[PDB]
Structures are given as C-alpha cells and as structure tokens.
Amino acid sequence: SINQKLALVIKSGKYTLGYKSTVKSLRQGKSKLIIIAANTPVLRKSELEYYAMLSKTKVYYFQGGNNELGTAVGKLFRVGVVSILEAGDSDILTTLA
Amino acid sequence: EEEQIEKDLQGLQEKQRLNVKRERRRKNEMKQKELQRMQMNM
Amino acid sequence: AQRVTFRRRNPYNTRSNKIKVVKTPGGILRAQHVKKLATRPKCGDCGSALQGISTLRPRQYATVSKTHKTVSRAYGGSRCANCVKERIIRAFLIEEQKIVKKVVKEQTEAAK
Amino acid sequence: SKGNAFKHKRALVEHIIQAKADAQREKALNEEAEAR
Amino acid sequence: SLEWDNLGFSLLPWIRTGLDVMGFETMTPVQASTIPMLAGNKDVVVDSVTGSGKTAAFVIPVLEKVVKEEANTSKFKKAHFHSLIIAPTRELSRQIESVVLSFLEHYPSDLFPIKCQLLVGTNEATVRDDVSNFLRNRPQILIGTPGRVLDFLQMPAVKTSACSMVVMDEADRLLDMSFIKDTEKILRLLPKQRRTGLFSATMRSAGSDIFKTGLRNPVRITVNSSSLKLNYCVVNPAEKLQLLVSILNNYKFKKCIVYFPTCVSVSYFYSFIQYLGKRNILVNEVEIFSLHGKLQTSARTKTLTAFTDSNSVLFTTDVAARGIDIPDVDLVIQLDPPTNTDMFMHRCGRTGRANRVGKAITFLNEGREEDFIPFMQVKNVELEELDLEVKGITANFYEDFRNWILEDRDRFDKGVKAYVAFIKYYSNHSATSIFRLQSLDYVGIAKLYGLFRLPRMPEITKYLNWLVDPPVNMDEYKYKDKKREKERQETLKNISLINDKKKLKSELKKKNLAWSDKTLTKERKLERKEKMSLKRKAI
Ligand SMILES: [Zn+2]
Numbered sequence: 031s032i033n034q035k036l037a038l039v040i041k042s043g044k045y046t047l048g049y050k051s052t053v054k055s056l057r058q059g060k061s062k063l064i065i066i067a068a069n070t071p072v073l074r075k076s077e078l079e080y081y082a083m084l085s086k087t088k089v090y091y092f093q094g095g096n097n098e099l100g101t102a103v104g105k106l107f108r109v110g111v112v113s114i115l116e117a118g119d120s121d122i123l124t125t126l127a
Numbered sequence: 128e129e130e131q132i133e134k135d136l137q138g139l140q141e142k143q144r145l146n147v148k149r150e151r152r153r154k155n156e157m158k159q160k161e162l163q164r165m166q167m168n169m
Numbered sequence: 170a171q172r173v174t175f176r177r178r179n180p181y182n183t184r185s186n187k188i189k190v191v192k193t194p195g196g197i198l199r200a201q202h203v204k205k206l207a208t209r210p211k212c213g214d215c216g217s218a219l220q221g222i223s224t225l226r227p228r229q230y231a232t233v234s235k236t237h238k239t240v241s242r243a244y245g246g247s248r249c250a251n252c253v254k255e256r257i258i259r260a261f262l263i264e265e266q267k268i269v270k271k272v273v274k275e276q277t278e279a280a281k
Numbered sequence: 282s283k284g285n286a287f288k289h290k291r292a293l294v295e296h297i298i299q300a301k302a303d304a305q306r307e308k309a310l311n312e313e314a315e316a317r
Numbered sequence: 318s319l320e321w322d323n324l325g326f327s328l329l330p331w332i333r334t335g336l337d338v339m340g341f342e343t344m345t346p347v348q349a350s351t352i353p354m355l356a357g358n359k360d361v362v363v364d365s366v367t368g369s370g371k372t373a374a375f376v377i378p379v380l381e382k383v384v385k386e387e388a389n390t391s392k393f394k395k396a397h398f399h400s401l402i403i404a405p406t407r408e409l410s411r412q413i414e415s416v417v418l419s420f421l422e423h424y425p426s427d428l429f430p431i432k433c434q435l436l437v438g439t440n441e442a443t444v445r446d447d448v449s450n451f452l453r454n455r456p457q458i459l460i461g462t463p464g465r466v467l468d469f470l471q472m473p474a475v476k477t478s479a480c481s482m483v484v485m486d487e488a489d490r491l492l493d494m495s496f497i498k499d500t501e502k503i504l505r506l507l508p509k510q511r512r513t514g515l516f517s518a519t520m521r522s523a524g525s526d527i528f529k530t531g532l533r534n535p536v537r538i539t540v541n542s543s544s545l546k547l548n549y550c551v552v553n554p555a556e557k558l559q560l561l562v563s564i565l566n567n568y569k570f571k572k573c574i575v576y577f578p579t580c581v582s583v584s585y586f587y588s589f590i591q592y593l594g595k596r597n598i599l600v601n602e603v604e605i606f607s608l609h610g611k612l613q614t615s616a617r618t619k620t621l622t623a624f625t626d627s628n629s630v631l632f633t634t635d636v637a638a639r640g641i642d643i644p645d646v647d648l649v650i651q652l653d654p655p656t657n658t659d660m661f662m663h664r665c666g667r668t669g670r671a672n673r674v675g676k677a678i679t680f681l682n683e684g685r686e687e688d689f690i691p692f693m694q695v696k697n698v699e700l701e702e703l704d705l706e707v708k709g710i711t712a713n714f715y716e717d718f719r720n721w722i723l724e725d726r727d728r729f730d731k732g733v734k735a736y737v738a739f740i741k742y743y744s745n746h747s748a749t750s751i752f753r754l755q756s757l758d759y760v761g762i763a764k765l766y767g768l769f770r771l772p773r774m775p776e777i778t779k780y781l782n783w784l785v786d787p788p789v790n791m792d793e794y795k796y797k798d799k800k801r802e803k804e805r806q807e808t809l810k811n812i813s814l815i816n817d818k819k820k821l822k823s824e825l826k827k828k829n830l831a832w833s834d835k836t837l838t839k840e841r842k843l844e845r846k847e848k849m850s851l852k853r854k855a856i
Contacts, residue, residue, distance in 0.1 A: 041534040042358035044510055073255065076262050097165050106161060119358040119534075132750050136317075139303065139310050305494070309658075309747040316692050317750070 032092075033102040035122035036065070036112070040104050043118025047103065049074055052113040056081045062123055063088045065112040069095035078111060090127060173200040210238075214252040222246060319343045325353045329384060332377060335423040345370035347540050348377070351514075356381045360513045360535040362488075362527055364520035366542060368642060368670050372416050375402075375484050375514050379458065380420065380431070382482050382512070388457045389429045396475055399457040400482035403503070405490040407437040407462055407614060408621060409640035413486065414460045436461030436469050439614035444468050448475065463491065463499040470506045477507050485530065487639055488515035489523040489659070497529065504531055518666070522659050545669030548703035549679040551686045555715065555764035556707050557652065558586065563708040564678070565630060566599040570647035573630045576664055578653050578742045580609035580634055581735040587632045588728075589767075592721060598709075604629050610636035638664045649677045654689060657747050658696070678703065682758055688751040718767030719785065726796040736766045740776060755780045 039045060046055050049070075055061045056078075064087055066075060082089050092099050096108040103109055117123045179186045188200045207226050209218040223237045230238055239246035244253050287293045321333060321344055328336075344352075347365045355361045355378040365371050379400045383389060388399040404410040414435045424431060434456045436447055447469055459466065470477060483504070485491050491500050513530055517523070521539075552560055561575065577583045587607035593599065608620045608631060617636075624631050625643050637643075638660055646667050655661050668675025679700070681689060690700050722728045739762065746752040759781045763771055769785040771777045792809070796802045808815070827833060 073259060073262070076266075077258060080262065080265065095169065097168060101165070128755065136310070136314060136750070139306060140314060142303070143307060143310065306747070306749070309749075312692065312695060313748050313750050315695055316688060316748075 032122075032127055035120050035125075035127065036102050037104055038120035039114060039117060039122055041119070043114065043120060044116035045103075046113040046115060047105065047109045047111075049078070049111055052078065052111045053081060055113045055115060056085045056087060059085060060115050061085065061087045061113045062117065063090060063114040065090045065092050065099065065114075067092050067094065067096040067099040067110050069097075070110045074110070171198045173198055175202075176200055177202065210246075212249040212252060213247055215249065217249060219246065219249060319346070319349055324349075326356060326381075328352075328377070329381065331423055331425055332380060332420070335420050336373075336377075338423060339419065341370065341373075345374070347371055347538075348374040350538055350540075351375070352378050352381075354536055355512065355514050356385070358512070358534060360532040361515065362520060362532070362535055362537040363514070363516045363540075364538065365516075365518060365540040367518055367666050369540065371516050372413060372486075373420075375486070375516055376413075376417055376420055378514070379417075379482055379484065383431060383457050386481060389431045391429060393429075393455075393457070394476075394479065395455060396452060397479040398459050398475075398477070399480060400459070400484070401466070401480060401507070402458070402460040402484045402486065403463060403466065403491060403500070404460075404486045404640065405462070405496060406610070406636055406640065407439075407617070408636070409486065410437055410460050410462055411435060411618070412641060417458060417460065431458070432456035433458035433460060436465045437614065438462065438465045441615055444472065448472050451475065463496060463503060467499055467503050470503065480507050480511060482512050482514075483507060483530075484514045484516070486516050487518075488527070488530070489517040489519050490639060492523045492526040492529060497526070501529070519659055519662065544672040545665070545674075546676040547665060547679075547698065547700050548676060549681060549690070549700045550703055550705050551681040551683055552705075552707070554682055554758050554761035556710065557680050557765055558589075559710045559714055560680070560705060560707055561650065561652065562590075562593070562599055563705065564648075564650065565603060566601050567708070568648060568676075571628060572624075572643065572646040573648040573650065574637065574643075574646060574667060575630060575632050575650045576638065576652060576655075577609075577632055577634060578656075579735060579738040580611045581731060581738050583607050583609040583632045583634055585728075585731045585735045585766075588731075589718065589721065590632075593717075602628050605632070606630070607632045608637060609634045635660060635664070638667075642670070643667065644670075647675050649675070651677070651679045654679055654681075654752075656742060656745060658692065661693075662698070682761075684756045684758060685751055685753055688748075692748060692751055715764055715767065719769055722767050722769075723789070723794075724797070726794050727798065729794070732766050732768055733770075733772055736763060736768055737772050737774065740774060744776075760784070 046052055046061075052061070052064060056064070064078065064082055066078060066089065068091065070078075079089065081087075092102075094102070096110045099112065100107055100109040103112060114122065173188070173190055175186060175188065177186060184205075187203045189203050190198055191201050193199050205226075207224045207229075209224045210222050211217065212219055219240075221240050223233065225233070242250065242253065244256075248256075282293065287296060321328065321336060324344075346369075347363065348370045351361055351363055351374045355375065361375075363371065363374070365374075379402070383399050386399065387393070393399075402410070402413055404413060414433055417433050421431060421433070432454055434447070434451055434454070436459060444465070447465075451469075452474065459469075461469070469475060485500070490496065509531055510533070511531075513532055513535075515527060515530060515532075520527075520537075527535075550560065565573065577586065584607060587605065590605060594603075594605070604627075606620055606624050606629060608617060608624070610617070612620075621637075621641075631637070635655065638655075649665050649668055651661070651664055655664060665677035665679075668677065693700055722732055740759075743752065743757060744754065754776055757776075757780070759771065759777060763784060769783065769789065771782040771784075796805050830836065
C-alpha cells in the first residue's frame with residue numbers, strides 16, 4: 031500500500047505538512063517527493079506543480095481528499111500536501127511512489 | 128480516626144472508577160463525532 | 170423632560186429624516202436632523218471593505234486628494250491586495266500553460 | 282464552568298485545590314488500597 | 318554475542334578506539350539493545366539497573382547521529398545545536414558531560430571539532446556568559462538541568478531549529494509533577510520531528526506520562542538481572558540521632574551516606590555533630606561533610622569532589638540520592654523514609670555495585686511502622702528487621718543538646734526552623750494511611766531536635782507548651798551576634814507598636830470579611846441574648 035509507507039515516513043523520517051511548509055522546503059531544495067491531495071484548490075495545485083518543475087521534485091497525486099491524506103499520514107486534521115524531506119526507515123522513494 | 132481513612136480511600140476509588148468510565152464514554156463519543164465530521168465534508 | 174419634534178416639512182418617521190436630541194447653549198432640548206451614514210468602498214472581486222480608503226458620501230470624494238481614496242499598489246482603490254495577488258499568479262500560470270500547450274501542438278503536428 | 286459545574290468563585294477555587302490534591306494522591310492510592 | 322565488532326551499523330573508528338581505551342571488555346545488554354535502535358530511526362524508552370552502561374548507551378548514539386547528519390562540518394550554522402541532554406540535578410549533568418568529554422578525548426584532529434556545553438545554574442557564570450561562549454565556541458551537544466537550559470533556550474540569540482536528538486536521563490524524575498512544568502516548555506521550544514531517548518532505572522513508574530515527551534516511533538526496553546542488605550530499625554524518634562551516632566562509631570565502613578529530609582536539617586545536625594566530635598563523644602577517624610542542594614554550585618562541586626576523594630560521612634538531601642556514583646560507599650542510612658517511595662530504591666541504591674557488601678538502614682517512628690514494611694513487600698522489596706542497642710544514652714543527651722542550644726540564639730532559630738520544615742515535609746507525604754499527621758509523635762520529634770517549646774502550628778494545636786518544665790524567657794536570651802543583637806533589642810523596645818499594627822490589621826481584616834456588618838449585627842444579638850440569660854437564669 032501507499033498508506034503504510036507514508037505512516038512509516040511520519041513515524042521515522044522527516045516531513046512537512048501543509049502548503050506553506052511544502053513551498054518553503056521546495057525553495058530550500060530539501061524536498062524529495064511531494065504528495066498532493068485531490069481536494070486542493072486548482073490555483074495552489076498549479077503553483078505547486080510549477081514550483082516542483084522548477085525544483086525538479088517528484089510529484090505523486092494522492093487518490094483521496096485532504097482528510098483522507100491526513101488520516102493516511104496519521105493526523106486528525108486535514109493536510110492538503112505533504113513533502114518528504116527524508117524517507118528515513120521507509121522505502122517510498124525507492125519504489126517510485 | 129480510621130473511619131476517615133476508610134471513607135476517603137473509598138471515595139477516591141469510586142471517583143477513579145467514575146473517571147475511567149466517563150473517559151471511556153467521552154473517548155468513544157468524540158471518536159465517533161470526529162469520524163462523522165470528517166466524513167460529512169464530502 | 171422637554172418634548173421636541175421635527176424641524177422640517179416631513180412629519181413621518183422615514184429613514185430620510187432622523188432626529189437626535191441635543192441641549193443647546195440656551196439650556197433647552199432641541200431636535201437635529203442626522204444625515205445618512207457613509208458606506209465603506211468595497212472590493213470589486215470579493216466585496217470586502219477596502220483598506221486605507223476614507224469613508225465618505227458619494228459627492229464628498231470630489232473634494233479630497235487622491236491619496237485619501239487610493240492605494241499605491243496596482244488596482245489600488247478598486248481591488249484588495251489578495252485579489253491582486255491571485256490575479257498576478259493566475260495570469261502568469263495561464264501564460265505558462267499557453268506556452269506549454271503551443272509547444273505540445275507544435276510537436277504533435279511535426280510528425281507529418 | 283460552561284456546563285454549570287461551578288456556582289461561584291469559592292467553588293471554583295476549592296475544586297482547583299482538590300484537583301491538585303487528587304492528582305497528587307492517585308498514584309499511591311492503588312498501592313495503599315492493596316496494602317490494607 | 319556482546320561483541321562490538323558484530324554490531325549492526327559498524328561503529329565509527331574513533332568511537333571504537335575510545336571504547337577500547339576505556340575498556341568495558343564488551344558491550345552490556347543495555348548498550349547492545351539500545352545503540353542499534355536509538356541510531357536507527359526509533360525513539361527509546363530504557364529501564365535498567367544502576368551502573369549498567371546506560372550513560373555510554375545514550376552517549377554513543379548521540380555522537381553517531383551527530384556525525385551522520387553532518388553536524389561536524391562547516392555547513393553547520395551558527396547559534397544552532399544538534400543534541401540536548403537533560404538531567405534532574407546539576408552533578409548528574411556534570412558527570413554526563415565528563416563522560417562525553419572522555420569519549421571525545423580520542424576524537425581525531427584535522428576535522429571540524431565536536432564540542433559540548435554544560436548549562437547548569439551556577440554563581441560563577443550568568444546565562445549571558447553561556448550565550449556568549451555558545452556563540453563563540455559553537456558546540457553541537459548541550460547538557461544541563463531543566464531550569465538553566467530553559468533560560469538558555471528562551472534567549473533570542475539561540476536557535477533550536479536544527480536539533481534532532483533529545484535525551485532525558487532519569488526520565489521518570491523529569492516527568493514528575495514538579496519537573497513537568499519546565500520540561501513541557503523545554504520540549505515546546507524544540508522541534509517535534511526528532512529522536513527521543515528516555516533513560517531511567519524506574520521508567521515503569523512514569524507509566525502514561527512518557528507520551529508527554531512526544532515519542533514518535535518508540536520501543537520500550539526492560540533489562541533485569543543478595544547484592545546488598547536492606548534493614549530497618551523501629552525506635553523512638555527522640556533517640557534517632559543518638560542511634561545514628563551509635564552506628565557511626567561502631568560499624569565498619571569506608572563511606573557512609575546519611576540522608577536527611579531537609580536542607581536546614583542537614584546544616585543544623587551537621588553543626589551539632591561537629592560540636593559533639595569536638596567534645597570527643599565519638600572517637601574515630603571520621604571526616605564529616607554536609608551537602609544539600611541549596612548551596613552555591615561551586616561549594617557543592619568542591620564538597621562532592623572532597624568526599625569522593627579517609628573514612629567519610631556525608632549528610633546529604635535527596636540531591637545525591639539519584640544518578641551520581643561515589644565508589645567505595647559501604648553504608649547508606651535513611652534517617653527517615655523518603656517523601657515518595659519510588660526514590661527509596663534510589664537512596665539505598667548507591668551501594669551493591671558488582672554485588673559489593675553494602676548495607677542500607679532505615680528508621681521508623683514506632684507508631685505506624687506496621688504499614689511501611691508490607692508496603693515495600695507488595696512492591697517486591699523485603700526489609701529484614703535489625704535490632705540495634707542505643708549505646709551511650711542514660712540521661713544527658715537531650716540535656717546536652719538543650720544546653721548547647723542555649724549558647725547561641727542562632728542555634729535555637731535553626732533548630733526550630735528545621736523542626737517546622739520537617740513537619741511541612743511530613744505534610745506532603747504520599748501513602749497517607751502509612752504516614753499519618755495525627756499519629757505523628759510531635760513531642761518525640763521536638764525532643765529529637767533539642768527544642769524546648771512547640772512552635773505554633775495548626776498541627777500542634779489540633780492533633781496535640783514547654784518541654785523544659787522550668788521555662789526560659791526569650792528576653793534574656795542573647796543572640797550572641799553583634800549586628801543582630803541591636804536589631805533584636807530595638808524590636809523588643811517596639812513591642813507595643815508592632816502589636817498595635819497587627820491589631821489594626823486584624824480589625825481591618827474583620828471589617829473586610831464576608832458580610833462583616835451582618836456578622837457584627839449577629840454578634841450583637843447573640844451577646845445581648847446570652848448576657849440577658851446569664852442573669853435571668855440566676856435570678
Ligand atoms: Zn478582494
């Protein structure tokens with residue numbers, strides 16, 4: 031699954047939840063992968079896509095809303111986009127996911 | 128003299144039992160409430 | 170405990186004529202008609218009150234300087250800051266998408 | 282207090298201090314009960 | 318296997334060299350089961366017995382993580398740190414820092430250095446000196462007590478954003494009710510995404526409070542193995558100090574640690590025992606020291622290093638009970654059982670290293686002594702009763718204490734203050750049934766401290782004066798100190814004025830109480846009716 035890898039990343043790796051943190055990490059070049067929820071607004075989604083193209087950061091389109099993505103991460107609040115600074119113990123980066 | 132010790136031990140134990148029960152009740156209620164709230168946005 | 174009444178032709182409790190009671194320097198209570206309150210200018214995109222613009226009656230804007238009814242930013246005095254930011258971002262992204270689509274069309278028509 | 286658990290100032294203060302006492306006591310309450 | 322070579326992640330060559338020079342001949346089970354995981358994206362919760370390699374067990378992964386995350390490089394920023402280490406007492410943190418320095422001794426040159434800084438409350442260095450040398454020296458390891466590290470982190474010159482490793486030693490004590498207020502703030506300042514290591518010999522007691530630290534991917538670790546003797550004596554309180562003497566000059570030991578409830582008690586009884594030794598009451602090659610936690614830091618360090626360095630007795634509070642290890646300690650005496658029983662195992666735990674022949678003794682008040690032993694038994698602790706004769710007391714000991722108190726009024730003040738402090742300390746006691754204020758031998762305890770009058774307390778008035786039958790007036794009692802003698806005489810000459818000030822304060826408090834006018838009205842009615850009945854019944 032993809033939820034197990036995300037949960038392992040949150041448990042052991044390094045991550046940023048939210049649009050502002052994701053954009054800041056994209057600017058700083060510390061992002062390895064950005065997971066985008068399907069519920070995010072179109073303008074912010076396009077801005078994130080352009081920033082990822084500029085920073086050459088891999089993009090994964092999550093199959094669910096921001097609340098499903100928040101539950102997958104392990105937080106009881108909605109998250110619209112996640113950025114993976116360090117995979118840590120998990121292998122989400124290796125499997126092209 | 129010892130009646131006060133017996134009374135306060137019994138009272139604190141009953142309070143602890145009621146606290147455990149009410150925490151279990153509220154935990155179930157809020158978990159159901161947050162699940163329903165999270166699912167209502169779609 | 171003195172009673173006062175309208176000072177103009179209209180005898181009805183209409184929105185146009187509203188009365189306040191004031192004590193004049195003669196020691197007596199007298200009525201005074203109050204004008205309609207001014208409404209803050211609103212943004213043309215979201216309808217929120219514009220920041221940094223004085224609130225006046227429609228004809229009172231003709232007598233004040235331009236700094237009291239504008240903002241130094243583009244669209245200042247017509248649209249708020251967030252709406253202008255969205256407009257800039259949207260325009261740039263639309264232009265980029267047009268460029269990408271044109272390149273894609275050039276490539277897909279280059280096969281033949 | 283929003284649920285009308287306290288009826289005036291003294292009740293709230295007494296509840297706070299009693300909560301402090303109980304939060305001091307609960308950890309040893311179980312072993313004391315087992316001892317008797 | 319317990320071999321350094323066959324560990325999972327192939328420890329760094331200089332860490333291995335430091336280990337080999339230090340030795341240990343192998344790696345302990347704690348270091349075998351904690352180092353692979355604390356450096357492997359897992360938070361750690363470790364319970365282990367005292368002196369089982371725990372300090373190195375959380376120091377080696379710290380250095381491994383520091384090297385791994387490129388903390389020892391020019392890329393590392395200024396005013397930033399990598400790892401934090403917290404301990405409940407200053408001596409424990411200084412000892413941890415000494416261990417880290419010993420490990421870093423063999424750190425190779427020709428590379429960006431790795432340094433540590435100790436942040437403890439001291440009278441030799443303000444927090445601004447700490448900030449200045451933190452900026453100048455740029456360390457990657459911080460070690461300290463919660464108060465000074467909280468003050469240090471609150472300074473705007475220090476940035477905590479690059480921290481990636483937090484270690485709490487004696488984590489059950491740092492999550493205690495008293496320390497939780499400071500540690501909550503300390504963890505609030507630091508980033509949440511980090512690796513946490515909690516280490517404590519009684520980590521099970523802090524049951525659900527470990528998640529207050531913010532563990533992410535945790536693994537609890539429990540390590541288990543007659544090393545030492547646990548005794549107790551049930552005697553009248555007024556004899557307790559005498560019994561202490563009868564142990565000091567008769568038992569066989571190299572180091573004896575005597576625990577006292579309060580700091581003022583430590584100083585007061587230290588002075589009185591020194592006075593007894595002046596008169597040659599106890600004749601032995603014993604050097605007696607006092608060490609409580611309210612001293613200046615330099616004095617505490619000097620006293621501890623003098624005691625650690627020939628037969629020595631230490632009068633210490635619970636500061637020295639936990640963590641610190643003084644070798645060659647033979648005897649441990651707990652003049653009173655501790656306020657919390659969890660620390661009891663620590664107080665008598667200073668001995669028994671490598672199954673050494675060491676004895677622990679405790680004293681009981683004869684009233685509710687039937688409850689302490691079964692309480693420890695339920696907690697899997699067996700206390701074998703010891704019978705000790707009260708040698709050298711026929712009639713004079715309390716008389717000697719009393720006539721020594723009469724020499725200086727400062728001695729009287731210290732004694733009464735210590736007695737009242739002990740009464741307050743007994744008031745804050747867990748296991749209320751075992752330690753009852755009502756059943757407390759107030760007269761016995763007062764006789765123990767040499768006092769000749771019960772201080773005005775609610776406890777004394779309710780649950781129970783002149784111990785010396787011919788009373789002594791305070792007017793002829795001389796303070797013996799020139800500066801304060803004139804102040805006392807001035808206050809004596811102003812007795813009526815201060816009394817009237819307090820009288821006016823009392824009247825104003827009367828008028829400011831709840832519905833005071835109504836209370837005066839009710840008193841008027843009651844007084845009139847009662848004084849009418851006082852004659853109408855007689856007539
Ligand atoms: Zn707008």
